[PDB]
Amino acid sequence: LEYPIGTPQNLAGMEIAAVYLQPIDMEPEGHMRKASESDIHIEADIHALSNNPNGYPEGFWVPFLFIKYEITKVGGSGAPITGDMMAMVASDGPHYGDNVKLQGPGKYKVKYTIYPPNAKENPMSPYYGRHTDRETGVRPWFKTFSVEWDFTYAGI
Amino acid sequence: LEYPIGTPQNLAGMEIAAVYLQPIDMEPEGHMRKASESDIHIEADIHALSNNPNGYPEGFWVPFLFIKYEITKVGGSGAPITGDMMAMVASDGPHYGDNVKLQGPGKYKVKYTIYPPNAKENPMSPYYGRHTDRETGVRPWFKTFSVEWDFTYAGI
Ligand SMILES: [Cu+]
Ligand SMILES: [Cu+]
Ligand SMILES: [Fe+3]
Ligand SMILES: [Fe+3]
Ligand SMILES: [Fe+3]
């Protein structure tokens, strides 16, 4: 089962939603924190809106992005939980996610930093292209942006 | 306007169609053969079918694949034209494609070799995951396969 973190935010011709669930098992092994050592599996569900400037039809998953997360416990006496999400596929389709260990129940601040395919930070920069010619060309990639939400962790 | 290469073939829970159009200009530069040095831009349009075993909803583009192509001129006294396609986005959405120089008008044989994200040959093996756990898990990736077509090049 999936639990939402705030309401989805629409930016750069995309709908950015943040959900969480029980920790997961993934292939290749050694990328995700072990489920037994994790608290949640945090996800970034990024999908195209109508008239997306980079050629994606409505509802399509936006691939080859790189998402960095920052999770801070509201009022908590702990450091921010940071990490990088990974592109993966599940029963609900492709998404960006990571297995995370939290700092107990309470209110938390979540911040995602979405990097375009051409970003200096994006390892998949040389693997994904964009047509520029008049006939089949699309608009330049969006510039790196951040997105925040507040959520109450109860303990799932 | 795109021109078709035979009829699409349905394999491994996907619909595999081969098209071509005029050569393109792509960002980043230095990956595609120059449009002035090319004859066509060959594409592989791979989309999910209903009941796709790896979690893709119907119509969705299948990402992180690696496609190798082999183009032979029927009866022609020329070497086969080979290469690797690249994941890119255009006005019609994401796909795999490459700029190719043909050997004049005539009948041709096209052969694509589709590699799953976990393939030894696929550079994007450490970049794309798959849930394996009972609840959110999907079926293992398809095994590497080939698809062939015959087409008549008239000259764009
Ligand atoms: Cu995931
Ligand atoms: Cu292309
Ligand atoms: Fe393994
Ligand atoms: Fe294993
Ligand atoms: Fe999800």
Ligand SMILES: [Fe+3]
């Ligand atoms: Fe196309």
